[PDB]
Amino acid sequence: MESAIGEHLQCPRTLTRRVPDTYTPPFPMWVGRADDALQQVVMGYLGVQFRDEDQRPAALQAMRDIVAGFDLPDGPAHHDLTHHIDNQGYENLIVVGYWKDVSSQHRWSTSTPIASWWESEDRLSDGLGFFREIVAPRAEQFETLYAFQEDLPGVGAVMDGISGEINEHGYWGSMRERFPISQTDWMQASGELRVIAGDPAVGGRVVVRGHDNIALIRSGQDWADAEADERSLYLDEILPTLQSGMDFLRDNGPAVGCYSNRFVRNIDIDGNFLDLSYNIGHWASLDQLERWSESHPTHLRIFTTFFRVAAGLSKLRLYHEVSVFDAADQLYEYINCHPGTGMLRDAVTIAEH
Amino acid sequence: MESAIGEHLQCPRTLTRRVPDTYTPPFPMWVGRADDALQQVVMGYLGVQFRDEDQRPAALQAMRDIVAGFDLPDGPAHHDLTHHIDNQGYENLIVVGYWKDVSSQHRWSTSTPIASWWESEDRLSDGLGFFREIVAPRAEQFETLYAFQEDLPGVGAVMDGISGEINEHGYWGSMRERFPISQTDWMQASGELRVIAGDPAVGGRVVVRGHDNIALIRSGQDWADAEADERSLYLDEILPTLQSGMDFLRDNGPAVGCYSNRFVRNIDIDGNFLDLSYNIGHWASLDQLERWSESHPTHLRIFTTFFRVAAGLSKLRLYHEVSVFDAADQLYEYINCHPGTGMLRDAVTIAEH
Ligand code: HEM
Ligand code: HEM
Ligand SMILES: [Mg+2]
């Protein structure tokens, strides 16, 4: 069988898998493929936050301004738009951009139209919240998994194509093994999520730095092309269990090591909902993510519910991408967001250390 | 933290764990310890089988004869007695003995009073079924896990003591990592479960040989010391899930790679029930046992229910022992047993391979 790890990323092992090499997965799954040109990507989650209805026009315009900047030289190779309401009752529009290299994203961010917009006094006077959560995993530091082969969302869209059926899935610990770095590295978390400028409690501009091997999961659901009975199966049987799990991570984050949990629905440029959704989850460690997925009743309920109704599925599209990052390859910037936004909730404040 | 692997069995690794060094389990568990003298143990399951009520006195007396043989030189260091009814309606009394070394068990088994009884033509004429399922893992080939510290049942009873709190538990795959041989070996199954003498379809004396890395789990429950409120919790909430899982494995064995599944209840010498039970499960591979425990809805139901009710438990005792063996260290012998008994069911006959 094909391996989840790209040919060019395969190397002499020092760390080994948890299954013997006779292992054969019980069902087909696929991963994104890319050659050695794709060395390190940039995932940039750009947000607009508001709570009052009268702020919606301004927020939607801000989102449109951000998307317009994505067309400029060195804009991202791919992007999508989402909406969610957080546990403080704030609406959040997030545009996620994927760049195929670090220098392009840097040239983009430092260009006049983009840099003057982000540094503008308008950002403090708009009354909206703004954030940028920008992470740059190397090709060895992310893994994908798709229950389909065509039209890959997320990071898959900036990769070169699709694999054949892969071996490293269908057992807990398989996510870890799909990370090419797992051949060598434990991806052990160390350090603190830290405020380096400002104060969350006062608002204004706040900058947060990450620590070694923060993990980010984007796990998605696409039911747009499903027919009547299958859509009914996702909506009636699968989603309530998924919602319960998302609610748990959103409201019990510190207890399990989840810095931020967002359950988001795709939108068009006008804010209308599309039949695609995903979790955006930031974790204190890959291993804390492993433990929750494999042993918390919430994901296990999702897991067993899936296999119970799996026979009636065919058009539903389920996938995830998971990334870990060097300490230095992350920045989380906030402007006028509430103190529980993203990395602001759990970051250690400047006095605190 | 202490390791589940005895100090004298720790060696340079070719195979690694699935958790980083920082891993700390969320609840305490302990393992049996034995010093460098213990090199290989013997687990001898000696059974008496019958279905007619008029056979019960002879069956219980045969069980007493077996227990009496344990008082002879080189008898086992520990034993216990159990009862179950199999899916063919036969009652099975099983006396399990544990020996601290292979040679002592061999000396006992070949001694005149023991060998003459097993080889007697009276075993054919008794009308009862008899069986000996005797397996001998090296110290590097078995692991134990106890959710308690005192009065170890099973193989723990013949070990030297109890460990402190251990690191290698609380995640799927931890069982494998508690096997000292996992440091260097995949414990990959190979070969066939083979009839080597006799014919299961004709009855009489049948002899079955195991293959490399068959796995045997004894997973036990002891509620004898629990008070009323906890007794009800186990019997009403936990036991039904366990029963469901055991029935599944008993009746769908070939589908999941479980050669033989028994859910047995401890009894005293007179056949009266005790409030201790355990699974005796023989598996085609350790990894099939891994797959079932971690991903089959039956054990996941057991596992999720346990953590749901865990707060109401304190005196309930849960544990397991899991072993793998070379082909040569397994002997499965049957006298007038029905053809679904233990390893008779799935064994390949002389010309089938
Ligand atoms: C309806 C939605 C979901 C379904 C049906 C589902 C189902 C599953 C399945 C079947 C697997 C095993 C995949 C394989 O290896 O073949 C899996 C793995 C995993 N899922 Fe989910 N999941 C869902 C949503 C989520 C979400 C929102 C998260 C975010 C925390 C999540 C986290 C994980 C992780 C971390 C793994 C990897 C476990 C490992 O390989 O060690 N899942 N999921
Ligand atoms: C009411 C009875 C049972 C309960 C409450 C239960 C619960 C659990 C728990 C909590 C664990 C995790 C232990 C740890 O690592 O800390 C576990 C592991 C395991 N259980 Fe069960 N269990 C029960 C019965 C059984 C039975 C009868 C079997 C027979 C196949 C079984 C097979 C396994 C295996 C093979 C593992 C190891 C998983 C691994 O580390 O990869 N369990 N069980
Ligand atoms: Mg590193």
Side-chain angles (χ1 to χ4, degrees), chain A residues 15-19 171-173 176 186 188 290-291 294, chain B residues 15-22 171-173 186 290 294:
Chain A
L15 309 185
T16 57
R17 301 171 63 188
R18 78 161 281 232
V19 298
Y171 55 94
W172 307 107
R176 180 173 287 271
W186 290 107
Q188 178 163 305
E290 282 174 307
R291 305 286 84 77
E294 81 185 357
Chain B
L15 307 188
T16 55
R17 292 176 66 187
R18 70 159 296 221
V19 298
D21 272 338
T22 49
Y171 53 96
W172 309 104
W186 287 109
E290 282 177 312
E294 79 181 11

PDB file of all heavy atoms in Angstrom, chain A residues 15-19 171-173 176 186 188 290-291 294, chain B residues 15-22 171-173 186 290 294:
ATOM      1  N   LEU A  15      12.139   6.645  15.095  1.00  0.00           N
ATOM      2  CA  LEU A  15      10.906   6.333  15.806  1.00  0.00           C
ATOM      3  C   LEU A  15      10.028   5.462  14.918  1.00  0.00           C
ATOM      4  O   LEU A  15       9.992   5.638  13.699  1.00  0.00           O
ATOM      5  CB  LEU A  15      10.151   7.612  16.218  1.00  0.00           C
ATOM      6  CG  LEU A  15      10.898   8.732  16.968  1.00  0.00           C
ATOM      7  CD1 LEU A  15       9.914   9.836  17.363  1.00  0.00           C
ATOM      8  CD2 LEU A  15      11.659   8.197  18.186  1.00  0.00           C
ATOM      9  N   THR A  16       9.323   4.525  15.541  1.00  0.00           N
ATOM     10  CA  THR A  16       8.593   3.511  14.785  1.00  0.00           C
ATOM     11  C   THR A  16       7.084   3.611  14.984  1.00  0.00           C
ATOM     12  O   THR A  16       6.604   4.274  15.910  1.00  0.00           O
ATOM     13  CB  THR A  16       9.084   2.113  15.161  1.00  0.00           C
ATOM     14  OG1 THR A  16       8.939   1.918  16.572  1.00  0.00           O
ATOM     15  CG2 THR A  16      10.566   1.940  14.766  1.00  0.00           C
ATOM     16  N   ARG A  17       6.351   2.931  14.104  1.00  0.00           N
ATOM     17  CA  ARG A  17       4.890   2.902  14.162  1.00  0.00           C
ATOM     18  C   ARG A  17       4.396   1.997  15.286  1.00  0.00           C
ATOM     19  O   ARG A  17       5.185   1.318  15.930  1.00  0.00           O
ATOM     20  CB  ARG A  17       4.324   2.471  12.813  1.00  0.00           C
ATOM     21  CG  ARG A  17       4.724   3.372  11.648  1.00  0.00           C
ATOM     22  CD  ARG A  17       4.322   2.762  10.329  1.00  0.00           C
ATOM     23  NE  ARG A  17       2.874   2.633  10.240  1.00  0.00           N
ATOM     24  CZ  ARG A  17       2.242   1.983   9.265  1.00  0.00           C
ATOM     25  NH1 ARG A  17       2.931   1.419   8.292  1.00  0.00           N
ATOM     26  NH2 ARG A  17       0.914   1.914   9.267  1.00  0.00           N
ATOM     27  N   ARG A  18       3.085   2.005  15.538  1.00  0.00           N
ATOM     28  CA  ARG A  18       2.510   1.218  16.634  1.00  0.00           C
ATOM     29  C   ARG A  18       1.750   0.001  16.115  1.00  0.00           C
ATOM     30  O   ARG A  18       1.151  -0.761  16.893  1.00  0.00           O
ATOM     31  CB  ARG A  18       1.588   2.083  17.498  1.00  0.00           C
ATOM     32  CG  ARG A  18       0.200   2.339  16.893  1.00  0.00           C
ATOM     33  CD  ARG A  18      -0.765   2.767  17.982  1.00  0.00           C
ATOM     34  NE  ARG A  18      -1.217   1.595  18.728  1.00  0.00           N
ATOM     35  CZ  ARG A  18      -2.496   1.287  18.969  1.00  0.00           C
ATOM     36  NH1 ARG A  18      -3.487   2.080  18.576  1.00  0.00           N
ATOM     37  NH2 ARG A  18      -2.779   0.173  19.633  1.00  0.00           N
ATOM     38  N   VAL A  19       1.748  -0.150  14.796  1.00  0.00           N
ATOM     39  CA  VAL A  19       1.215  -1.345  14.158  1.00  0.00           C
ATOM     40  C   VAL A  19       2.349  -2.062  13.423  1.00  0.00           C
ATOM     41  O   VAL A  19       3.264  -1.393  12.922  1.00  0.00           O
ATOM     42  CB  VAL A  19       0.058  -1.021  13.169  1.00  0.00           C
ATOM     43  CG1 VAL A  19      -1.128  -0.392  13.904  1.00  0.00           C
ATOM     44  CG2 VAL A  19       0.532  -0.138  12.016  1.00  0.00           C
ATOM     45  N   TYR A 171      -6.627   3.549  13.133  1.00  0.00           N
ATOM     46  CA  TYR A 171      -6.185   3.165  14.470  1.00  0.00           C
ATOM     47  C   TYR A 171      -5.718   4.414  15.193  1.00  0.00           C
ATOM     48  O   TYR A 171      -5.166   5.313  14.570  1.00  0.00           O
ATOM     49  CB  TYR A 171      -5.051   2.135  14.427  1.00  0.00           C
ATOM     50  CG  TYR A 171      -3.834   2.520  13.607  1.00  0.00           C
ATOM     51  CD1 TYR A 171      -2.724   3.143  14.198  1.00  0.00           C
ATOM     52  CD2 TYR A 171      -3.778   2.246  12.245  1.00  0.00           C
ATOM     53  CE1 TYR A 171      -1.591   3.481  13.435  1.00  0.00           C
ATOM     54  CE2 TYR A 171      -2.670   2.587  11.483  1.00  0.00           C
ATOM     55  CZ  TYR A 171      -1.579   3.189  12.070  1.00  0.00           C
ATOM     56  OH  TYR A 171      -0.492   3.502  11.271  1.00  0.00           O
ATOM     57  N   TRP A 172      -5.939   4.476  16.495  1.00  0.00           N
ATOM     58  CA  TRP A 172      -5.513   5.662  17.246  1.00  0.00           C
ATOM     59  C   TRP A 172      -4.004   5.695  17.231  1.00  0.00           C
ATOM     60  O   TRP A 172      -3.355   4.669  17.428  1.00  0.00           O
ATOM     61  CB  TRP A 172      -6.029   5.623  18.674  1.00  0.00           C
ATOM     62  CG  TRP A 172      -7.476   5.402  18.723  1.00  0.00           C
ATOM     63  CD1 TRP A 172      -8.111   4.264  19.104  1.00  0.00           C
ATOM     64  CD2 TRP A 172      -8.493   6.331  18.337  1.00  0.00           C
ATOM     65  NE1 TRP A 172      -9.469   4.437  19.023  1.00  0.00           N
ATOM     66  CE2 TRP A 172      -9.731   5.695  18.547  1.00  0.00           C
ATOM     67  CE3 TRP A 172      -8.476   7.648  17.855  1.00  0.00           C
ATOM     68  CZ2 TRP A 172     -10.948   6.321  18.285  1.00  0.00           C
ATOM     69  CZ3 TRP A 172      -9.695   8.283  17.604  1.00  0.00           C
ATOM     70  CH2 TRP A 172     -10.910   7.609  17.813  1.00  0.00           C
ATOM     71  N   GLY A 173      -3.439   6.881  17.017  1.00  0.00           N
ATOM     72  CA  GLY A 173      -1.998   6.963  16.787  1.00  0.00           C
ATOM     73  C   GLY A 173      -1.619   7.050  15.320  1.00  0.00           C
ATOM     74  O   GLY A 173      -0.457   7.347  14.995  1.00  0.00           O
ATOM     75  N   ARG A 176      -0.602  10.698  14.196  1.00  0.00           N
ATOM     76  CA  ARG A 176       0.798  10.947  14.489  1.00  0.00           C
ATOM     77  C   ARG A 176       1.683  10.380  13.388  1.00  0.00           C
ATOM     78  O   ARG A 176       2.596  11.065  12.913  1.00  0.00           O
ATOM     79  CB  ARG A 176       1.169  10.378  15.863  1.00  0.00           C
ATOM     80  CG  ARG A 176       2.647  10.580  16.267  1.00  0.00           C
ATOM     81  CD  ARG A 176       2.888  10.130  17.712  1.00  0.00           C
ATOM     82  NE  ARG A 176       2.316  11.065  18.681  1.00  0.00           N
ATOM     83  CZ  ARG A 176       2.950  12.118  19.195  1.00  0.00           C
ATOM     84  NH1 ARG A 176       4.215  12.386  18.850  1.00  0.00           N
ATOM     85  NH2 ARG A 176       2.321  12.914  20.059  1.00  0.00           N
ATOM     86  N   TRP A 186       9.360  13.527  18.330  1.00  0.00           N
ATOM     87  CA  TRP A 186       8.214  13.291  19.212  1.00  0.00           C
ATOM     88  C   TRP A 186       7.160  14.401  19.181  1.00  0.00           C
ATOM     89  O   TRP A 186       6.039  14.214  19.683  1.00  0.00           O
ATOM     90  CB  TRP A 186       8.707  13.113  20.654  1.00  0.00           C
ATOM     91  CG  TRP A 186       9.451  11.828  20.872  1.00  0.00           C
ATOM     92  CD1 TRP A 186      10.803  11.669  21.044  1.00  0.00           C
ATOM     93  CD2 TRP A 186       8.885  10.515  20.932  1.00  0.00           C
ATOM     94  NE1 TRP A 186      11.103  10.343  21.220  1.00  0.00           N
ATOM     95  CE2 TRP A 186       9.948   9.612  21.148  1.00  0.00           C
ATOM     96  CE3 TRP A 186       7.579  10.015  20.830  1.00  0.00           C
ATOM     97  CZ2 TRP A 186       9.751   8.231  21.260  1.00  0.00           C
ATOM     98  CZ3 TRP A 186       7.389   8.639  20.933  1.00  0.00           C
ATOM     99  CH2 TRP A 186       8.467   7.767  21.153  1.00  0.00           C
ATOM    100  N   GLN A 188       7.076  17.062  20.974  1.00  0.00           N
ATOM    101  CA  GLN A 188       6.795  17.297  22.380  1.00  0.00           C
ATOM    102  C   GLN A 188       6.641  18.790  22.603  1.00  0.00           C
ATOM    103  O   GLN A 188       7.484  19.566  22.160  1.00  0.00           O
ATOM    104  CB  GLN A 188       7.933  16.731  23.242  1.00  0.00           C
ATOM    105  CG  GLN A 188       7.778  16.959  24.732  1.00  0.00           C
ATOM    106  CD  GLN A 188       8.674  16.064  25.544  1.00  0.00           C
ATOM    107  OE1 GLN A 188       8.641  14.845  25.412  1.00  0.00           O
ATOM    108  NE2 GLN A 188       9.482  16.665  26.401  1.00  0.00           N
ATOM    109  N   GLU A 290      -4.582  13.943  20.805  1.00  0.00           N
ATOM    110  CA  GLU A 290      -4.701  12.475  20.695  1.00  0.00           C
ATOM    111  C   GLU A 290      -5.589  11.894  21.789  1.00  0.00           C
ATOM    112  O   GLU A 290      -6.536  11.146  21.506  1.00  0.00           O
ATOM    113  CB  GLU A 290      -3.317  11.829  20.725  1.00  0.00           C
ATOM    114  CG  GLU A 290      -2.599  11.940  19.413  1.00  0.00           C
ATOM    115  CD  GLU A 290      -1.176  11.428  19.499  1.00  0.00           C
ATOM    116  OE1 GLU A 290      -0.453  11.885  20.393  1.00  0.00           O
ATOM    117  OE2 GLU A 290      -0.785  10.569  18.680  1.00  0.00           O
ATOM    118  N   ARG A 291      -5.305  12.284  23.030  1.00  0.00           N
ATOM    119  CA  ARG A 291      -6.027  11.775  24.178  1.00  0.00           C
ATOM    120  C   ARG A 291      -7.505  12.121  24.054  1.00  0.00           C
ATOM    121  O   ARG A 291      -8.325  11.234  24.208  1.00  0.00           O
ATOM    122  CB  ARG A 291      -5.468  12.307  25.492  1.00  0.00           C
ATOM    123  CG  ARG A 291      -3.973  12.067  25.705  1.00  0.00           C
ATOM    124  CD  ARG A 291      -3.650  10.625  26.043  1.00  0.00           C
ATOM    125  NE  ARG A 291      -3.527   9.800  24.850  1.00  0.00           N
ATOM    126  CZ  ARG A 291      -2.458   9.796  24.058  1.00  0.00           C
ATOM    127  NH1 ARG A 291      -1.429  10.575  24.320  1.00  0.00           N
ATOM    128  NH2 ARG A 291      -2.407   8.994  23.010  1.00  0.00           N
ATOM    129  N   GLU A 294      -9.344  10.020  21.306  1.00  0.00           N
ATOM    130  CA  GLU A 294      -9.344   8.562  21.454  1.00  0.00           C
ATOM    131  C   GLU A 294     -10.026   8.062  22.718  1.00  0.00           C
ATOM    132  O   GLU A 294     -10.387   6.888  22.793  1.00  0.00           O
ATOM    133  CB  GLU A 294      -7.913   8.016  21.392  1.00  0.00           C
ATOM    134  CG  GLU A 294      -7.148   8.148  22.704  1.00  0.00           C
ATOM    135  CD  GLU A 294      -5.708   7.719  22.609  1.00  0.00           C
ATOM    136  OE1 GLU A 294      -5.278   7.252  21.539  1.00  0.00           O
ATOM    137  OE2 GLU A 294      -4.990   7.852  23.617  1.00  0.00           O
TER     138      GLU A 294
ATOM    139  N   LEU B  15      12.392  -0.336  18.742  1.00  0.00           N
ATOM    140  CA  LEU B  15      11.005   0.108  18.569  1.00  0.00           C
ATOM    141  C   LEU B  15      10.637   1.050  19.700  1.00  0.00           C
ATOM    142  O   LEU B  15      10.986   0.806  20.854  1.00  0.00           O
ATOM    143  CB  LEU B  15      10.038  -1.082  18.553  1.00  0.00           C
ATOM    144  CG  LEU B  15      10.328  -2.222  17.570  1.00  0.00           C
ATOM    145  CD1 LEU B  15       9.183  -3.228  17.549  1.00  0.00           C
ATOM    146  CD2 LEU B  15      10.634  -1.713  16.158  1.00  0.00           C
ATOM    147  N   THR B  16       9.926   2.115  19.349  1.00  0.00           N
ATOM    148  CA  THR B  16       9.591   3.171  20.285  1.00  0.00           C
ATOM    149  C   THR B  16       8.103   3.256  20.660  1.00  0.00           C
ATOM    150  O   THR B  16       7.245   2.666  20.017  1.00  0.00           O
ATOM    151  CB  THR B  16      10.060   4.541  19.747  1.00  0.00           C
ATOM    152  OG1 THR B  16       9.518   4.770  18.442  1.00  0.00           O
ATOM    153  CG2 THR B  16      11.571   4.581  19.662  1.00  0.00           C
ATOM    154  N   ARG B  17       7.830   4.026  21.709  1.00  0.00           N
ATOM    155  CA  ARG B  17       6.471   4.264  22.185  1.00  0.00           C
ATOM    156  C   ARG B  17       5.704   5.221  21.278  1.00  0.00           C
ATOM    157  O   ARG B  17       6.277   5.807  20.355  1.00  0.00           O
ATOM    158  CB  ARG B  17       6.537   4.820  23.610  1.00  0.00           C
ATOM    159  CG  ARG B  17       7.051   3.801  24.617  1.00  0.00           C
ATOM    160  CD  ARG B  17       7.200   4.377  26.017  1.00  0.00           C
ATOM    161  NE  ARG B  17       5.914   4.754  26.632  1.00  0.00           N
ATOM    162  CZ  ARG B  17       5.811   5.395  27.792  1.00  0.00           C
ATOM    163  NH1 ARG B  17       6.908   5.736  28.463  1.00  0.00           N
ATOM    164  NH2 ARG B  17       4.618   5.705  28.291  1.00  0.00           N
ATOM    165  N   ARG B  18       4.410   5.395  21.565  1.00  0.00           N
ATOM    166  CA  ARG B  18       3.551   6.321  20.812  1.00  0.00           C
ATOM    167  C   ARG B  18       3.217   7.607  21.554  1.00  0.00           C
ATOM    168  O   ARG B  18       2.422   8.412  21.070  1.00  0.00           O
ATOM    169  CB  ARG B  18       2.242   5.648  20.393  1.00  0.00           C
ATOM    170  CG  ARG B  18       1.269   5.345  21.516  1.00  0.00           C
ATOM    171  CD  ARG B  18      -0.166   5.167  20.981  1.00  0.00           C
ATOM    172  NE  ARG B  18      -0.669   6.404  20.399  1.00  0.00           N
ATOM    173  CZ  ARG B  18      -1.909   6.877  20.557  1.00  0.00           C
ATOM    174  NH1 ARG B  18      -2.814   6.197  21.240  1.00  0.00           N
ATOM    175  NH2 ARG B  18      -2.245   8.032  20.009  1.00  0.00           N
ATOM    176  N   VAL B  19       3.787   7.757  22.744  1.00  0.00           N
ATOM    177  CA  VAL B  19       3.626   8.970  23.569  1.00  0.00           C
ATOM    178  C   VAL B  19       4.995   9.575  23.864  1.00  0.00           C
ATOM    179  O   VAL B  19       5.969   8.837  23.990  1.00  0.00           O
ATOM    180  CB  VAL B  19       2.882   8.672  24.902  1.00  0.00           C
ATOM    181  CG1 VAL B  19       1.479   8.160  24.622  1.00  0.00           C
ATOM    182  CG2 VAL B  19       3.628   7.646  25.747  1.00  0.00           C
ATOM    183  N   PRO B  20       5.079  10.925  23.966  1.00  0.00           N
ATOM    184  CA  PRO B  20       6.339  11.552  24.372  1.00  0.00           C
ATOM    185  C   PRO B  20       6.663  11.320  25.856  1.00  0.00           C
ATOM    186  O   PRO B  20       5.832  10.791  26.602  1.00  0.00           O
ATOM    187  CB  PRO B  20       6.108  13.036  24.062  1.00  0.00           C
ATOM    188  CG  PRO B  20       4.647  13.225  24.149  1.00  0.00           C
ATOM    189  CD  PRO B  20       4.037  11.928  23.674  1.00  0.00           C
ATOM    190  N   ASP B  21       7.873  11.701  26.263  1.00  0.00           N
ATOM    191  CA  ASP B  21       8.385  11.448  27.614  1.00  0.00           C
ATOM    192  C   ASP B  21       7.591  12.143  28.706  1.00  0.00           C
ATOM    193  O   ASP B  21       7.554  11.671  29.846  1.00  0.00           O
ATOM    194  CB  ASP B  21       9.843  11.912  27.721  1.00  0.00           C
ATOM    195  CG  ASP B  21      10.833  10.839  27.326  1.00  0.00           C
ATOM    196  OD1 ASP B  21      10.475   9.638  27.365  1.00  0.00           O
ATOM    197  OD2 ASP B  21      11.980  11.204  26.996  1.00  0.00           O
ATOM    198  N   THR B  22       6.973  13.266  28.353  1.00  0.00           N
ATOM    199  CA  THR B  22       6.227  14.087  29.304  1.00  0.00           C
ATOM    200  C   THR B  22       4.901  13.451  29.699  1.00  0.00           C
ATOM    201  O   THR B  22       4.282  13.890  30.667  1.00  0.00           O
ATOM    202  CB  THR B  22       5.958  15.521  28.770  1.00  0.00           C
ATOM    203  OG1 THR B  22       5.426  15.452  27.438  1.00  0.00           O
ATOM    204  CG2 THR B  22       7.240  16.363  28.792  1.00  0.00           C
ATOM    205  N   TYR B 171      -3.862   5.065  27.315  1.00  0.00           N
ATOM    206  CA  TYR B 171      -3.924   5.375  25.886  1.00  0.00           C
ATOM    207  C   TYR B 171      -3.867   4.064  25.124  1.00  0.00           C
ATOM    208  O   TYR B 171      -3.175   3.135  25.549  1.00  0.00           O
ATOM    209  CB  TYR B 171      -2.762   6.290  25.447  1.00  0.00           C
ATOM    210  CG  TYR B 171      -1.383   5.777  25.824  1.00  0.00           C
ATOM    211  CD1 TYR B 171      -0.609   5.055  24.912  1.00  0.00           C
ATOM    212  CD2 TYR B 171      -0.855   6.006  27.096  1.00  0.00           C
ATOM    213  CE1 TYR B 171       0.650   4.582  25.253  1.00  0.00           C
ATOM    214  CE2 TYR B 171       0.410   5.533  27.456  1.00  0.00           C
ATOM    215  CZ  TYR B 171       1.158   4.812  26.524  1.00  0.00           C
ATOM    216  OH  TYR B 171       2.405   4.316  26.848  1.00  0.00           O
ATOM    217  N   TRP B 172      -4.596   3.968  24.010  1.00  0.00           N
ATOM    218  CA  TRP B 172      -4.581   2.759  23.193  1.00  0.00           C
ATOM    219  C   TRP B 172      -3.173   2.566  22.699  1.00  0.00           C
ATOM    220  O   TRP B 172      -2.514   3.527  22.292  1.00  0.00           O
ATOM    221  CB  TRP B 172      -5.561   2.868  22.029  1.00  0.00           C
ATOM    222  CG  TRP B 172      -6.908   3.287  22.494  1.00  0.00           C
ATOM    223  CD1 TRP B 172      -7.480   4.525  22.364  1.00  0.00           C
ATOM    224  CD2 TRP B 172      -7.842   2.484  23.215  1.00  0.00           C
ATOM    225  NE1 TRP B 172      -8.723   4.536  22.943  1.00  0.00           N
ATOM    226  CE2 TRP B 172      -8.978   3.291  23.466  1.00  0.00           C
ATOM    227  CE3 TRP B 172      -7.840   1.145  23.658  1.00  0.00           C
ATOM    228  CZ2 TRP B 172     -10.101   2.811  24.159  1.00  0.00           C
ATOM    229  CZ3 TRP B 172      -8.951   0.665  24.351  1.00  0.00           C
ATOM    230  CH2 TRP B 172     -10.073   1.492  24.581  1.00  0.00           C
ATOM    231  N   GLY B 173      -2.716   1.323  22.747  1.00  0.00           N
ATOM    232  CA  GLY B 173      -1.320   1.019  22.460  1.00  0.00           C
ATOM    233  C   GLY B 173      -0.462   0.848  23.693  1.00  0.00           C
ATOM    234  O   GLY B 173       0.639   0.302  23.595  1.00  0.00           O
ATOM    235  N   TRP B 186       7.939  -6.844  17.262  1.00  0.00           N
ATOM    236  CA  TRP B 186       6.581  -6.487  16.834  1.00  0.00           C
ATOM    237  C   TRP B 186       5.492  -7.442  17.332  1.00  0.00           C
ATOM    238  O   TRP B 186       4.300  -7.147  17.168  1.00  0.00           O
ATOM    239  CB  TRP B 186       6.502  -6.419  15.297  1.00  0.00           C
ATOM    240  CG  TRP B 186       7.179  -5.224  14.704  1.00  0.00           C
ATOM    241  CD1 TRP B 186       8.343  -5.210  13.981  1.00  0.00           C
ATOM    242  CD2 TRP B 186       6.750  -3.863  14.806  1.00  0.00           C
ATOM    243  NE1 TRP B 186       8.659  -3.913  13.620  1.00  0.00           N
ATOM    244  CE2 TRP B 186       7.696  -3.069  14.116  1.00  0.00           C
ATOM    245  CE3 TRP B 186       5.654  -3.235  15.414  1.00  0.00           C
ATOM    246  CZ2 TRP B 186       7.574  -1.677  14.006  1.00  0.00           C
ATOM    247  CZ3 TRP B 186       5.542  -1.846  15.318  1.00  0.00           C
ATOM    248  CH2 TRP B 186       6.492  -1.087  14.614  1.00  0.00           C
ATOM    249  N   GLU B 290      -5.932  -5.543  19.951  1.00  0.00           N
ATOM    250  CA  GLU B 290      -5.807  -4.078  19.983  1.00  0.00           C
ATOM    251  C   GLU B 290      -6.941  -3.416  19.200  1.00  0.00           C
ATOM    252  O   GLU B 290      -7.600  -2.510  19.711  1.00  0.00           O
ATOM    253  CB  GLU B 290      -4.443  -3.637  19.429  1.00  0.00           C
ATOM    254  CG  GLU B 290      -3.292  -3.802  20.405  1.00  0.00           C
ATOM    255  CD  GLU B 290      -1.953  -3.423  19.796  1.00  0.00           C
ATOM    256  OE1 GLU B 290      -1.677  -3.892  18.687  1.00  0.00           O
ATOM    257  OE2 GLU B 290      -1.193  -2.652  20.424  1.00  0.00           O
ATOM    258  N   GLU B 294     -10.045  -1.051  20.938  1.00  0.00           N
ATOM    259  CA  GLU B 294      -9.914   0.395  20.707  1.00  0.00           C
ATOM    260  C   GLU B 294     -10.938   0.965  19.745  1.00  0.00           C
ATOM    261  O   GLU B 294     -11.127   2.176  19.701  1.00  0.00           O
ATOM    262  CB  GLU B 294      -8.514   0.726  20.193  1.00  0.00           C
ATOM    263  CG  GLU B 294      -8.277   0.452  18.700  1.00  0.00           C
ATOM    264  CD  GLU B 294      -6.860   0.771  18.267  1.00  0.00           C
ATOM    265  OE1 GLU B 294      -6.002   1.003  19.155  1.00  0.00           O
ATOM    266  OE2 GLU B 294      -6.606   0.808  17.040  1.00  0.00           O
TER     267      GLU B 294
END
